[PDB]
Amino acid sequence: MPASRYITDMTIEELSRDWFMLMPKQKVEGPLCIRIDQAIMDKNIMLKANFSVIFDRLETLILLRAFTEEGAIVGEISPLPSFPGHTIEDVKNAIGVLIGGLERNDNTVRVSKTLQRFAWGSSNENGRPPLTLE
Q1: I need a labelling partner for 74 at 20 to 30 A (CA). Which of 22, 57, 98, 104 fits?
Q2: What share of the chain is helix, strand, coil (3-state, %, to 5)?
Q3: How far apart are CA 24 and CA 66, in angstroms?
């Protein structure tokens, strides 16, 4: 087997940090459950992830986290433990569903340097349905 690399893009300190959603919205996207908080607006947020790597691409996502430049965890993409054999194809879409929710809320988000060159790249999700009024 070729050597499998591990990206510790986000720290164990903040990975093991307890948090909640004040406006919880649960999207399921394949083997990856997307956490969307509808209240988090006007924030500068970063899409960070720890994962295994093979052939210089994302092999299996261990965990993905969305948190502000404040450090406050406002969202997450939790890989379901009952699915240990998922592809980078699943992950790149999942990142963009999380981002899509952040876009609706009107934040300012950026994807991690790692996720950009591994998963995101050319195949990037785009779009924001505006939060309509009555």
Answers
A1: 57
A2: 20, 35, 40
A3: 14
Using alpha carbons only, what angle is made at residue 30 by residues 96 and 101, rounded to the nearest 5 degrees? Answer: 30
Find the length of the chain.
Answer: 134
Q: Enumerate residues 6+ apart whose C-beta is below 8 A from 11.
A: none
Q: d(Cα 99, Cα 26) in Å, to the nearest integer? A: 14
Residue 87: exposed, middle, or buried by beta-carbon count in 10 A (0-12, 13-18, 19+)?
middle
Domain of residue 72: give its range.
Answer: 1-134
Decide if 22 contacts 37 (C-beta within 8 A): yes
Technique used: NMR
CATH at 103: 3.30.420.330
| Dist. CA 85–CA 11, nearest whole Å | 24
2's CB contacts (< 8 A; 6+ apart) are 54, 55
